[PDB]
Amino acid sequence: GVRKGWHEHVTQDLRSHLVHKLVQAIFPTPDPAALKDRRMENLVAYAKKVEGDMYESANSRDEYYHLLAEKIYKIQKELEEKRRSRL
Amino acid sequence: KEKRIKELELLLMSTENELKGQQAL
């Protein structure tokens, strides 16, 4: 497509939904409204940044999925927050 | 463990499939 050969497969909306997947996968947020909190805003910003970075890094859509899922895995493996998150 | 690995991984991967599946609303 435009920025990558695979680009046309993944529009902003899917990027947004994937960013949400990052947020919930890292931090299974109780309520969408909670995303307004500055703490969450930072995590949202992080997830956007990371997703963008992965998009530009990924030679192929499959890779984009892989290194994202891997990154999530690393986050939980390292930071292991899933259930704690709230705190 | 393995189940958790695959769930956490799959959660991300699922998205496009879920979306194109839910071609309704």
Side-chain angles (χ1 to χ4, degrees), chain A residues 2-69:
Chain A
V2 178
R3 62 175 72 184
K4 289 291 192 177
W6 63 274
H7 158 256
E8 73 287 351
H9 288 235
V10 185
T11 50
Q12 281 61 34
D13 306 78
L14 177 51
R15 300 177 213 196
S16 301
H17 207 109
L18 287 167
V19 166
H20 186 29
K21 293 304 190 60
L22 301 182
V23 179
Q24 58 175 265
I26 298 165
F27 195 115
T29 306
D31 192 290
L35 300 170
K36 295 186 293 183
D37 187 286
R38 304 300 78 201
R39 185 186 179 201
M40 297 309 302
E41 193 76 270
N42 278 261
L43 180 58
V44 170
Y46 174 91
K48 288 177 174 176
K49 191 178 179 294
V50 135
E51 183 278 316
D53 184 83
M54 295 323 183
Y55 207 112
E56 307 312 300
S57 302
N59 53 267
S60 307
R61 196 193 82 208
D62 181 80
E63 188 56 61
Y64 169 78
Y65 278 100
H66 177 27
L67 45 52
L68 281 168

Side-chain angles (χ1 to χ4, degrees), chain A residues 21 61 65 72-73 80, chain B residues 4-5 11 14-16 18:
Chain A
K21 293 304 190 60
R61 196 193 82 208
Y65 278 100
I72 299 171
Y73 209 88
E80 196 61 82
Chain B
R4 187 265 169 129
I5 303 308
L11 177 58
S14 67
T15 316
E16 59 187 11
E18 301 180 314

